[PDB]
RNA sequence: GCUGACUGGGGCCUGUAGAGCACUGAUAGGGCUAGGGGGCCCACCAGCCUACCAAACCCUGUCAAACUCCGAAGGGUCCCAGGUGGAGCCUGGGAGUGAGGGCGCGAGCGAUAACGUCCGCGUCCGAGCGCGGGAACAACCGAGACCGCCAGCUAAGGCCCCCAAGUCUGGGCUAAGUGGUAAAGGAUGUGGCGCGGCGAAGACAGCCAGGAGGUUGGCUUAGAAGCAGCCAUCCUUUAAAGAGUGCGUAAUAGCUCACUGGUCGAGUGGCGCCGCGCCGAAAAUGAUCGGGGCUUAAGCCCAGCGCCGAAGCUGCGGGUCUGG
RNA sequence: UCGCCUCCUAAAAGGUAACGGAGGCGCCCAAAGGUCCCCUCAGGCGGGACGGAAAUCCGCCGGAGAGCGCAAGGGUAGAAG
RNA sequence: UCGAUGUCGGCUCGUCGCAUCCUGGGGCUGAAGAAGGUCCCAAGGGUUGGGCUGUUCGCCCAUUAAAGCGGCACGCGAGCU
């Protein structure tokens, strides 16, 4: 789970992209210095960690910096990333979205059964050092009626996260 | 099926071969003889 | 390259698991001389002295990994592999000596053996047969 | 059919189709999906037009979303009537759609299907379109 | 008598493109719950709760000429500067002109039709049908023609011929006369990229060989051998084999098959990008890219040197009108 | 249809078109005017005999969504109410 | 184009065009033969007489292989009615 970024100096952003590289920016309370990486080298990674794991960098500086996207400007049209951003990880608890993965087979399936996963990630605070990956859900009792949400889930020791707790996390609607 | 502006594969034994300067399609049952037009 | 390590690695725990392993070559054999060459080599054995028409390219390694040789003379074509695990190696090699000499097969359609760890020849498939 | 229930003006000057999309560009819901490439007006009828075909290809299957919405009033003058003399009344509705505009998206529908679906689903539509799943659609963190 | 157009910097006016839902509305799906029918139940009617319609609440998603918490680029205006030009200010005598057009861009009408039409910015024709280029052609590109020369260099557009000037030099694609002008939508047409699947423990092509057992299970208002139809959803004799993609039968027998021994013994199949070309593709005297003709082009794409070519500009001479 | 007021159109100054898109005016008020002194909403959620789903009450949270003769719009409780 | 480009129909005389009505050809087919059905190639030559209506067109009668669709100022008035 590692990337090498090339120090952006401040040379036509258009260039980079219209080059073969993929510009970006890393930072945090202390820092904020324009950077860049290659397009491709990127995706392979993304498509795997995207933003639920932690990307470590190196740069020409043999400096490995632990991070994870705060966002990614996209392209509106002909979709394909534009800019990128990197949050230089500290030891201080931080706002990251835990990847969600529901387990078991839906009750209302034999019967009407088409599961809606509202938001399968989440605004969880925690020491970046200790970041569980996926969070165990359930369906061994999920019906077409309302459906589990908020804090009816497991909070791995150390995880406190910010929800409401309200946001219906998921549910099942009727087929066709 | 024979002459249409949308030639495709209808079944599995169909082969898209081209010739004379047009896409063609042959198969087991003539019931597929396709020919761009 | 997945089950190739599931099949070739399943070809030596039974290669290093015997005391009467042959591997002739069988050609022109119907669907009645095969369930008759093992229905006749498992009554004086049970579920151990099977009729294995194994692999030839999977024998230049299904034999050279647990570390061996003197094998570059016994399966250069469609070769089998008669591995005997239970019952004295004298009822599956006699019940193997008359299962190619009982339907009009020439007594030269086998390729030696490795019956207990000491190479084998062409006058020994007839020797440990009578 | 499909249209508001209310309006602040019945008749509305048509306008133009410039670049961008301003919105919707990502997933946010389904398991796979379609995306407009060319800009245009998509008529309600055309919307359900597919809508149906969809649910069709998959009898009692997955759950659909038609992230778009017509609500501009399509204007037509009377057959033959000539120029000037006031604006034709309504005829139907549309939904301006700037490229990269996701339109719908299935879910829980074996890809093979979700896809196949979103293929015909588009055949009703008057412009090319694109099939996708979930990628860089993650605006969480 | 230096204010003018235009330009810089200063200080502000403002609500368009966009984008966003905070106000006015439109919104697809979710969750939520003031409520009510209803039941346990007697009662000033407490409470428990509903495999029902739903106010609103927020969530997730977007929409807007007449919505804006938000707001550019621009434009305007005023101050200080630059700016000597057929710039301005001012007074007085005369005008003609008040049908407009085309093209680009911003918008209404129209059907995101029309050498249409109406308004804004700019251009041009008008009156620049004088020239060049554009096949011919007021308005598309060049460019502002006082007059002469048997002078020179370029602009646009060109460089094989008709017809002035490279059958010029490099490196790529094209195989249809595409170029020499129509779409959706289709396809093992080529050219350059991509990711996976697997092989010298000899894969896909190649051909002689095996395709077994439980076996043909049941629910039946005819019957289920893989071989109409559903649930359970694996074990046996194995080199390899299910209750088998099917040619092939009514249940079958079988030609054969996923799975495989292997003689063969080197790379090989199904999918995402871009260039570029094909089908789609029918109209009315006689054809056609202006024409003849073009195929490592006389095309197309990226380079490089160089000319041809105006009435524009120089050289030269003459005519002329304001200023000094 | 013909004069007039408001909004958009109208391309951030002004204005700017159509037999363009959408509403009004041809009145009123001796207090609805001068002025000086006083006072504060709309809603939402509880709480309340008649009581819708807003009457008039009581208690909180609520700066403007109420009102201002009338169309829309500008504006406005630090008052125009 | 109004200091004039004669305005339906017919008669006559034609020419053209394929999107083909015959006739020649082909493949499919739910094609056995026959007969058709639908699609392609293809105008070389054919594409009738009458009743009514000014009618073009229709609607009928009798045949036909077949009785096709259009353009030519919805051809054709210095050719005619």
From Swiss-Prot, chain A:
GO cellular component: cytosolic large ribosomal subunit
Protein name: Large ribosomal subunit protein bL25
Subunit composition and interactions: Part of the 50S ribosomal subunit. Contacts the 5S rRNA; has been isolated in a complex with 5S rRNA and uL5, 5S rRNA and DNA binding protein II; 5S rRNA and uL18; 5S rRNA, uL5 and DNA binding protein II.
UniProt keyword terms in alphabetical order: Ribonucleoprotein, Ribosomal protein, RNA-binding, rRNA-binding
UniProt-recorded Gene Ontology molecular function terms: 5S rRNA binding; structural constituent of ribosome
NCBIfam families xref list: bL25_bact_ctc
Role summary: This is one of 3 proteins that mediate the attachment of the 5S rRNA onto the large ribosomal subunit.
Keyword RNA-binding: yes
Family: Belongs to the bacterial ribosomal protein bL25 family. CTC subfamily.
Transmembrane feature ranges: none
Keyword rRNA-binding: yes
Domain of life: Bacteria
BP GO annotations: translation
CDD domains tied to this protein: Ribosomal_L25_TL5_CTC
Gene3D superfamilies reported in the protein's UniProt record: Ribosomal protein L25, beta domain, Ribosomal Protein L25, Chain P
SUPFAM superfamilies named among the record's database cross-references: Ribosomal protein L25-like (SSF50715)
Organism: Thermus thermophilus (strain ATCC 27634 / DSM 579 / HB8)
UniProtKB/Swiss-Prot annotation, chain B:
Cofactor: Zn(2+)
SUPFAM superfamilies to which the protein is assigned, alphabetical: Ribosomal protein L36
InterPro entries in alphabetical order: Ribosomal_bL36, Ribosomal_bL36_sp
GO BP: translation
Signal peptide range: none
Cofactor note: Binds 1 zinc ion per subunit.
GO cellular component, one term: cytoplasm
Binding site for Zn(2+): 11, 14, 27, 32
Keywords associated with the record: Metal-binding, Ribonucleoprotein, Ribosomal protein, Zinc
One GO MF term: structural constituent of ribosome
Quaternary organization: Part of the 50S ribosomal subunit.
NCBIfam families: rpmJ_bact (TIGR01022)
Family per similarity comment: Belongs to the bacterial ribosomal protein bL36 family.
PANTHER family: 50S RIBOSOMAL PROTEIN L36, CHLOROPLASTIC, LARGE RIBOSOMAL SUBUNIT PROTEIN BL36C
Full protein name: Large ribosomal subunit protein bL36
Species per Swiss-Prot/TrEMBL record: Thermus thermophilus (strain ATCC 27634 / DSM 579 / HB8)
Swiss-Prot record, chain D:
Biological-process GO terms, alphabetical: translation
GO CC terms: cytosolic large ribosomal subunit
One function term, GO molecular function aspect: tRNA binding
Pfam family membership, one: Ribosomal_L16
InterPro entries in UniProt: Ribosomal_uL16, Ribosomal_uL16_bact-type, Ribosomal_uL16_dom, Ribosomal_uL16_sf
Gene3D superfamilies: Ribosomal protein L10e/L16
Keywords carried by this UniProt record: Ribonucleoprotein, Ribosomal protein, RNA-binding, rRNA-binding, tRNA-binding
Entry-linked SUPFAM superfamilies: Ribosomal protein L16p/L10e
Domain of life assignment: Bacteria
Subunit comment: Part of the 50S ribosomal subunit.
Function of the molecule: This protein binds directly to 23S rRNA. Interacts with the A site tRNA.
NCBIfam families: rplP_bact (TIGR01164)
Family: Belongs to the universal ribosomal protein uL16 family.
Protein name (Swiss-Prot/TrEMBL): Large ribosomal subunit protein uL16
The gene coding this protein: rplP
